[PDB]
Symmetry: D2
């Protein structure tokens, strides 16, 4: 006649399902957060590569202008 | 002149300042993303603890009702 | 004449490349951290899906055994 | 009596505890991953601040050496 074990066991099964649903929603939101992290890191990496190349380009520009000045200096009285 | 080396060098310094501002804005957005990540993990950990306790509680309920039934059975004719 | 502006400007250009190199190494390490994060979330999502299905399976098992008991009860004297 | 409903229900309660233990281990590993992520972002933010200050410092050196040159040019024949 007593259904206390069954009632308590049924409630827990119901709560287990509720928790699995909430965990899925949390995990779906975490997938969008992981996409934001990737995008953010990608933009930063693009910025870093670009600037590293821009520093090298300026180094070469000045090296070319110096070489040009050495060519000019050879025409001076010495 | 000639101001070519100086112009190229000034341009790079300018570009670097502009890029440091954009990197800071990307890093500010990434700190909010870190916060969403921590929060998500915390919610999942809370869910885990809660369910672990809920299972243990039902196991205890079951052991208590079983013990109670053994005491009830001691009143039966044997 | 005096080369103080050029020395200071050369030093900064050198530091800019040093920093771009270190930022790249930090970003490469962050790519492996984003991979560990995806993997962790995937394992959790797999666990959540599996358990959600396991709860539904038990619910159906119980439902079938309850239906079987109704059929058994129909054979009792009434 | 038949104990099939109870065996199936007991098995689910058992599996849930086992899975909660594995989820906790995954979440503990994800806490270290979140720490590596924070650390990486802080190092990048420190790099950004440092370089921004280094560029500003060179800009000020340049302006000071230019002011100094204006003062010494005032001593030239005009
Ligand atoms: Cl009865
Ligand atoms: Cl259960
Ligand atoms: Cl420079
Ligand atoms: Cl007894
Ligand atoms: Cl009937
Ligand atoms: Cl003057």
């Amino acid at each position: 006649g007593s259904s206390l074990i069954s009632a308590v066991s049924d409630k827990l099964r119901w709560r287990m399902k509720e928790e699995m649903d909430r965990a899925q929603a949390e995990l779906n939101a975490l997938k969008r957060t992981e996409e934001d992290l990737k995008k953010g890191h990608q933009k930063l990496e693009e910025m870093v590569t670009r600037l590293d190349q821009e520093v090298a380009e300026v180094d070469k520009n000045i090296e070319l202008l110096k070489k040009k000045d050495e060519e000019l200096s050879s025409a001076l009285e010495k």
